[PDB]
Design a protein around this ligand. Structure first.
Ligand SMILES: CNc1nc(N)nc2c1ncn2[C@@H]1O[C@H](COP(=O)(O)O)[C@@H](O)[C@@]1(C)F
Ligand code: NA
Lengths: 115, 112
């Protein structure tokens, strides 16, 4: 299925509702359902890639496009003071949905270490 | 507008370099927050992700592919976290774009 059958594939195909911020031919940006900050959204590719550890060398442009879209959405949402971009990989990374996604958190002071 | 990461790229100060190519450098972080904590930075000086242009997409994605390849070579088979901090709220320390890659322990949520 185009986009796959994880909850993110369903959101890509408009089968499950989501709060969409931006959409193009390569990616979708939408608000996280359990926000860990005043502003917390996700940017996902439309192409299904299960995890960053299995991304191909030709996925570089797409992965960079997730970050460019994440920084554009953050500026459009008024995050003028900054934000944190996060990609979780596997069990130690805390990954719970196996479809690559970039978290963007802002609206508050983010702390160190990042988890 | 030089930065300490510019001195590392230029080999003017020591760093434990993990990998280098013609457009990026990966090296262990001097103040590690996990058993394995390294950075991947572009050689081109982009001060922060908020000012990166559309033409930089391939270079930014290259940081993540190099980061995931370095993590595999460093034995992070149980997973890891990749982080990019922007500005004061993001907790950005050096004004040279850097991708943090942290593993070797359970990463917690929220991510700071
Ligand atoms: C109702 N859904 C959720 N509710 C609550 N409370 N926490 C959730 C939900 N989904 C995920 N998480 C948390 O997000 C983290 C990052 O996951 P990923 O985005 O990188 O895949 C996970 O480790 C989690 C389970 F702590
Ligand atoms: Na610099």
């Amino acid at each position: 299925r185009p986009g796959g059958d994880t909850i993110f594939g369903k959101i890509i195909r408009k089968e499950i509702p989501a709060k969409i911020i931006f959409e193009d031919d390569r990616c979708l940006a939408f608000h996280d359902i359990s926000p860990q900050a005043p502003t917390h959204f996700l940017v996902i590719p439309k192409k299904h890639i299960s995890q960053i550890s299995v991304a191909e060398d030709d996925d570089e442009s797409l992965l960079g496009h997730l970050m460019i879209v994440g920084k554009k959405c953050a500026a459009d949402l008024g995050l003028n003071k900054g934000y944190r971009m996060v990609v979780n990989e596997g069990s130690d990374g805390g990954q719970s949905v196996y479809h690559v996604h970039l978290h963007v958190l802002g609206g508050r002071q983010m702390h160190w270490p990042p988890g």
